[PDB]
C-alpha cells in the first residue's frame, strides 16, 4: 500500500513518539462558562483599549488563571528528570502559536509579574514574530506549562499531547452556545471545553482535576482574577 | 489464580509505534434524516437497495480525504486512490473489509457493496477483501456507544468513529431545539497529521454531512 | 533566586508506564441519569434499620457485579487469559499518600448495607493508614470516582494485571431530551478504559450500556 513516496519533521516525529512513550499521559476534561469574561470584555474593553493601547482578549485571562492554578499545584509546574522531580520557582508558560511551518512554542516569561495589558502585548508580539519567521531560539526555549488553543480552528474537544520535559498541557477550544441548566432553568451559555493532558507519573487524579477546576472557577469570576 | 495473539501484538505496536491522539466533534443528523424520508422509498425502488447513512459517511470521508492527503497517506507514502476499510462485525470479532475506489462509486453502489461485505462477514465468506485501505470508518453506534477513542489500524494514519444518534437539546438561533446529534471521534497519528489538519478534516465531514445537497455536486 | 530544585513512587511510575505500554488501552464513554437512584435515596428507613447510610457507591458496585457476570472477559486477565469465578472489586479511595486500591471481596454475596459498611470501613482505614496489604491485594476490576474532585469526564488508566476500569464522575444538572421534551436531569459521564488485547468494542460498550441500564432502574438491582 504505497503509490507515491516523499522523503522526510523526523526529529519532531521522534519527540512526539517519545513524548507519548516516555510518559503516562492521560486527559481530564471540563467545561467553562465564557459569559462573565465576555461581559467584562464588553464593558471595560474599549476603555482598556485606549488607556492601554492593546486590545483586551481572552488569552490574558487564561494565562492569568493558569498562573494562579500553577501556584496552587507545584507538581503541575514541576518536571521529571530521569529519577528526580524538578520543581520551578518561576512561571514561564509556553504558548502554542501557529506559523506556516507548523505550530511553535513561544515562551512567555515570568507571567506572574505581567499585568493584563503586558500579557496582551507580548502575546501579540510573539504572534507576529511567528508570522514573520522572526521568532528567536531564545523565545522558543523554556516553559513549564503550555497553553494550546484549537478553538481558532473550530475544535470542539480534543486530547493535547504533552511537550517534554513539561508535565501537563491545557487545551482551549471553540466557544459554542450550549443549552445549560442554571437554577433548574435552561439557559443558553457560551460554553467551552477544557482538556488537560498530564503525565500521571508525577501528577495524579485529584490534582489534575483540582487544577482544572481552579481554572474553571477563576475564569467564571474574572473580577476574582483581574 | 483460577482457570488474538498476533492481534494483541498489532494493537500494542499500533499504540506504541504512533503518536495517537483523538479530536472529537458533533454533527446534526437532521438533514440527512430528512432526505432519507423524502426520497428513500423512491431510491429503494429505482435502485433496489435501501438508502442508509453509511453511504453519506463514506462519500463525505472521500471528499475530506481529497482535501487532506496526509490523512490518506501512511508512514511518507501518499495515495492516489481511495480505498476505505470499513469495520464490520463477525462472530470472531470485527473485520476490516476494504471498499475500493469509493470515489468512483455512486450512492447505491456503496450501499450495495457495504451490504455485500456485511453478509459475507456473517457467513465467513470474506476473502483475504481484507487487504488494503488508507482510512477506516468504524461505527459503534450500533452498540449504543455515545463517544469513544478509536485505535488506528496500521499502517493507516487516522480512523473515524461514528456513534449513537441521540436527541439532544441544542442552541439554534438563540433558541433551544432538540436535534439528533452524533459525536464523531477521529484518532490520528500525530507524527504525520497535525492539529489544524485533523480538526479541519473532521470539520469538513461535519459540514458536508449537515448539507447533503452539497456533498452531491 | 531562579532555581530548579530537584527533589529525590518511582516503582509506581514504572507501573503506570508499563500499564500504558503493555496494554492496548482505549476508552469508551457514556452518560447515566442519576434521577431514579436519587429518588430511592427509602434512605432514612434504610439508615435506621441498617445503621449505615444508603449512598450511591453500593448501587455502582452492584451494577458492576451484574455487568461482570455478563462479560467474563472484562473480569478476566491476560497473563503473558485467566478468567475469574469470583468477584473481587478494587475500589480506589484517597489517602494523604495518594490513592489506594482497597479490594472488596466477594461483593456478589454482599447486600446493600454490607457494601455500604465495608466501603466505609476501608475509607476510614485509608484515612488512618491502617489499610493492610491484605486489603490492597487482588481485585479483578476497579471502580474509581473523581466526582468527589469535581471531574466532569476523564480517561482512567488500567491497573494491571486488571483488564478494565470504570470511572465515575461529577453529577451535573444537564438539559436533556426526554419524550421530545427538554428536561433537566442529574447526568453523569461514565468512562470505561479497557485493554483491547482482551476486551473488544461490542463488549466494552455492552458492559457500559448494561451499567447505565441497571443504574437507571435500581428496582432491578435492589434484589437479584
Curated annotation (Swiss-Prot), chain A:
Catalytic residues (UniProt):
200, 204
Q: Which family does it belong to?
A: Belongs to the 2-oxoacid dehydrogenase family.
Q: What is its EC number?
A: 2.3.1.61
Reaction(s) the record says it catalyses: N(6)-[(R)-dihydrolipoyl]-L-lysyl-[protein] + succinyl-CoA = N(6)-[(R)-S(8)-succinyldihydrolipoyl]-L-lysyl-[protein] + CoA
Which species is this UniProt entry from? Answer: Escherichia coli O157:H7
| Top EC category | transferase
Pathway participation: Amino-acid degradation; L-lysine degradation via saccharopine pathway; glutaryl-CoA from L-lysine: step 6/6
What range of the intact protein is shown?
174 to 402 of 405
Name the needed cofactors.
(R)-lipoate
User: Cellular component per GO?
Assistant: cytosol; oxoglutarate dehydrogenase complex
**Gene that specifies this protein:** sucB
Quaternary structure (record):
Forms a 24-polypeptide structural core with octahedral symmetry. Part of the 2-oxoglutarate dehydrogenase (OGDH) complex composed of E1 (2-oxoglutarate dehydrogenase), E2 (dihydrolipoamide succinyltransferase) and E3 (dihydrolipoamide dehydrogenase); the complex contains multiple copies of the three enzymatic components (E1, E2 and E3). Interacts with SucA (via N-terminus), the E1 component of OGDH complex.
Superkingdom to which the source organism belongs: Bacteria
Name of the protein this chain belongs to:
Dihydrolipoyllysine-residue succinyltransferase component of 2-oxoglutarate dehydrogenase complex
Sorted keywords for this record are: Acetylation, Acyltransferase, Lipoyl, Transferase, Tricarboxylic acid cycle
- Coiled-coil annotation reads none
The keyword Acyltransferase belongs to this UniProt entry's keyword annotation: yes
A GO molecular function assigned to this protein is:
dihydrolipoyllysine-residue succinyltransferase activity
- Provide one Gene Ontology biological process annotation: L-lysine catabolic process to acetyl-CoA via saccharopine
Q: How is the cofactor bound?
A: Binds 1 lipoyl cofactor covalently.
- Role this protein plays: E2 component of the 2-oxoglutarate dehydrogenase (OGDH) complex which catalyzes the second step in the conversion of 2-oxoglutarate to succinyl-CoA and CO(2).
Upper lineage is: Bacteria, Pseudomonadati, Pseudomonadota, Gammaproteobacteria, Enterobacterales
Curated annotation (Swiss-Prot), chain C:
Q: What does this protein need as cofactor?
A: (R)-lipoate
How many cofactor units bind, and how?
Binds 1 lipoyl cofactor covalently.
Do the record's keywords include Glycosyltransferase?
no
Its recorded reaction(s) are: N(6)-[(R)-dihydrolipoyl]-L-lysyl-[protein] + succinyl-CoA = N(6)-[(R)-S(8)-succinyldihydrolipoyl]-L-lysyl-[protein] + CoA
Task: Give the UniProt keywords, A-Z.
Answer: Acetylation, Acyltransferase, Lipoyl, Transferase, Tricarboxylic acid cycle
GO biological process annotation, one example: L-lysine catabolic process to acetyl-CoA via saccharopine
Spell out the GO cellular component terms annotated for this protein, sorted alphabetically and separated by semicolons: cytosol; oxoglutarate dehydrogenase complex
Q: Which GO terms describe its molecular function?
A: dihydrolipoyllysine-residue succinyltransferase activity
So where's the catalytic machinery, residue-wise? 196, 200
**What metabolic or biological pathway is this protein involved in?**
Amino-acid degradation; L-lysine degradation via saccharopine pathway; glutaryl-CoA from L-lysine: step 6/6
Q: What is its EC number?
A: 2.3.1.61
Origin, by domain of life? Bacteria
Asked whether the UniProt record includes Acetylation among its keywords, one would answer yes
Q: What does this protein do?
A: E2 component of the 2-oxoglutarate dehydrogenase (OGDH) complex which catalyzes the second step in the conversion of 2-oxoglutarate to succinyl-CoA and CO(2).
Q: How does it assemble?
A: Forms a 24-polypeptide structural core with octahedral symmetry. Part of the 2-oxoglutarate dehydrogenase (OGDH) complex composed of E1 (2-oxoglutarate dehydrogenase), E2 (dihydrolipoamide succinyltransferase) and E3 (dihydrolipoamide dehydrogenase); the complex contains multiple copies of the three enzymatic components (E1, E2 and E3). Interacts with SucA (via N-terminus), the E1 component of OGDH complex.
Q: Which family is this sequence assigned to?
A: Belongs to the 2-oxoacid dehydrogenase family.
Name this polypeptide is given: Dihydrolipoyllysine-residue succinyltransferase component of 2-oxoglutarate dehydrogenase complex
Please name the taxonomic classification of the source.
Answer: Bacteria, Pseudomonadati, Pseudomonadota, Gammaproteobacteria, Enterobacterales
Full-sequence range covered: 173 to 404 of 405
Amino acid at each position: 500500500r504505497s503509490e507515491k513516496r516523499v522523503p522526510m519533521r523526523k526529529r519532531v516525529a521522534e519527540r512526539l513518539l517519545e513524548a507519548k512513550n516516555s510518559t503516562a499521559m492521560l486527559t481530564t476534561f471540563n467545561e467553562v462558562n465564557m459569559k462573565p469574561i465576555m461581559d467584562l470584555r464588553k464593558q471595560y474593553g474599549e476603555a482598556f483599549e485606549k488607556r492601554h493601547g492593546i486590545r483586551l482578549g481572552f488569552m490574558s485571562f487564561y494565562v492569568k488563571a493558569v498562573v494562579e492554578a500553577l501556584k496552587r499545584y507545584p507538581e503541575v509546574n514541576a518536571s521529571i528528570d530521569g529519577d528526580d522531580v524538578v520543581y520551578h520557582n518561576y512561571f514561564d508558560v509556553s504558548m502554542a502559536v501557529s506559523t506556516p511551518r507548523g505550530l511553535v512554542t513561544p515562551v512567555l516569561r515570568d507571567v506572574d509579574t505581567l499585568g493584563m495589558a503586558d500579557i496582551e502585548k507580548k502575546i501579540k508580539e510573539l504572534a507576529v514574530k511567528g508570522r514573520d519567521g522572526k521568532l528567536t531560539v531564545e523565545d522558543l526555549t523554556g516553559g513549564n506549562f503550555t497553553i494550546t488553543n484549537g478553538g481558532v480552528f473550530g475544535s470542539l474537544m480534543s486530547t493535547p499531547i504533552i511537550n517534554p520535559p513539561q508535565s501537563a498541557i491545557l487545551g482551549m477550544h471553540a466557544i459554542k452556545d450550549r443549552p445549560m441548566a442554571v437554577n433548574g432553568q435552561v439557559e443558553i451559555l457560551p460554553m467551552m471545553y477544557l482538556a488537560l493532558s498530564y503525565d500521571h507519573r508525577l501528577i495524579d487524579g485529584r490534582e489534575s482535576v483540582g487544577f482544572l477546576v481552579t481554572i474553571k472557577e477563576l475564569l467564571e469570576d474574572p473580577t476574582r482574577l483581574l
